[PDB]
Point group: D2
Chain length 171, copies 4
């Protein structure tokens, strides 16, 4: 037998423990188009039709964006775009109204409600109109059979839509 | 009614979705002491007794370390230190053996097994001995009623011990 | 050395693996009171004030119900009741409207919106009025600093309110 | 305006909230074969070779068992069986020893250690030998690239092996 003293300099009294962390993935699309018909006399939307290029997704990360395009997500090869079609705008007042439309994600379509909040209506510098509104609402992954392989535990079943728009009159 | 065109520059077609992420918290203790009796003739440990100052924890983060000291973790005010006491070393060969001892965390004591792996035995530059071994093993939070408030979901019930030691002869 | 044959009858080739499962806790309250002023000429609510006895919770399980009363949940000793006070009803049509009111849980108050859906308005058998409506909406635990000890991982931050009411005229 | 009183009999003041629950899946295999060479003079294993029919899995549930056979698990069509081959038994004493062998799951092979605990050695009623031992150890899903599609969050990366054997001498 013999006696030793630790060399604290090259000794590590260590442990590893596994924990979970919840975080929001925030994201948008760089490439989309829309048709907007709005009546500032009454603060009513008349037609709102949006097409989004799935390809142009951005969640501030280069490799997860590619993965979104694959079979277990968007399947962008087969279904390159997602679309929203307004069916009904029910005004609450000049600032607020309930929008109902058809959302289509990878060929599956469901009718959703978004909360329209009008942030500002104006006649601009040049005497031509502008508006700044938002559309907000929660859709369920399950309702669109979207990313069915991924469990509702790992990734929430709820997606929260926040569409923030500035827009000017045409021609 | 009137027609608008989005100003893509001040429009954001956005979404938020919640996901979970699993990660290892790695950590050690900066301040501990040990008594080590080892016989290089036979590669057997004779006595190994460690005292760790809970206060000196480090998981590479200043604020979680403080939180570890609180009631729902270490309770360092009441139980400032954790201790290991070897009871039995069962040699497998010169590189490997099974160590059995008493671990005490916040006043609760249980007998654990660690896997001893001898990385190197030597007579040094100056003709005095050295050794470099490791002790590895999994303990269960539940076995020590440790952090009972925190669910086995958020934080694993398993803690993985990795004690890496370099040490030299005494006097 | 010697050769053996398993007795399949008293041999078990076994394994254990840990998995997570997501489930809805559904619940209601057995004991509450309300004041309801409604105008069937216009399908508008005028006053809606509810008081719920936290004590009377029921999630189909005797022991979790008790636990709900404790400090890390309702604190029913200090805050025996939760209250809702209508501030504003904004009609959409005769079937649908947006209700805004003050919810109070354990002394913390916040203004919420519920979606009112009128399932049926009637003059009854005896020529006295009835109505059957629902109130639906999502509140956030975090908004009320409710059950702060429990992580948003183990238990959702979102509570989904579904108030289903049948009601008859007074005196 | 008009005043109503709830019909408590057909009124439900209700809520739904999502929570996670951790549970052990326990399981075994009904159909396997083994070759066992053991020396009761020294309490050493000499040869231990097991073949397990993946098909015969049982986790007390008819539909999850089928799912285990599919591509995202065992792929039983391609890889019908899992095998263990002992390479080395290192005795600790007559009750305990460390077993090292090759585990193969769906064509991927890795060397594992199991803790052998001898529960009983005997010469039976009829003067022929018996033994009753157990083999215990943790393997990692990731080490065998097993069920790669399923996240380490939903299902633990750790599988815990508990092989409980009774066995009698041959011919
Ligand atoms: S367009 C856009 C890019 C990145 C992010 N993001 O922060 O990950 C957003 C967003 O917050 O919606 C939008
Ligand atoms: S002593 C020490 C400090 C920090 C870390 N760490 O990486 O968080 C370790 C470790 O990896 O064990 C040790
Ligand atoms: S009042 C009531 C009791 C039990 C349940 N439950 O199913 O757990 C409910 C509900 O579904 O809302 C209501
Ligand atoms: S062979 C066998 C069948 C069922 C179970 N089970 O309880 O799910 C076991 C086990 O506990 O190992 C074994």
């Amino acid at each position: 037998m013999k006696e030793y003293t630790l060399d604290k300099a090259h000794t590590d009294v260590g442990f590893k423990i596994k924990h979970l962390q919840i975080s929001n993935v925030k994201g948008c699309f760089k490439d989309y188009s829309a048709v907007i018909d709005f009546d500032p006399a009454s603060a009513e939307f008349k037609k709102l039709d949006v097409t989004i290029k799935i390809a142009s997704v951005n969640t501030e990360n280069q490799t997860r964006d590619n993965h979104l395009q694959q079979d277990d997500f968007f399947k962008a090869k087969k279904y390159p775009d997602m679309t929203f079609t307004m069916k009904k705008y029910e005004k609450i007042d000049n600032e607020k109204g309930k929008m109902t439309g058809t959302l289509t994600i990878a060929g599956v379509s469901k009718d959703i409600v978004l909360d329209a909040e009008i942030g500002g209506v104006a006649k601009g510098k040049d005497g031509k109109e502008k508006i700044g509104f938002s559309l907000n609402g929660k859709i369920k992954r399950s309702d669109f059979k979207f990313a069915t392989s991924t469990s509702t535990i790992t990734l929430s079943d709820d997606i929260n839509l926040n569409i923030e728009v500035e827009a000017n009159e045409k021609e």
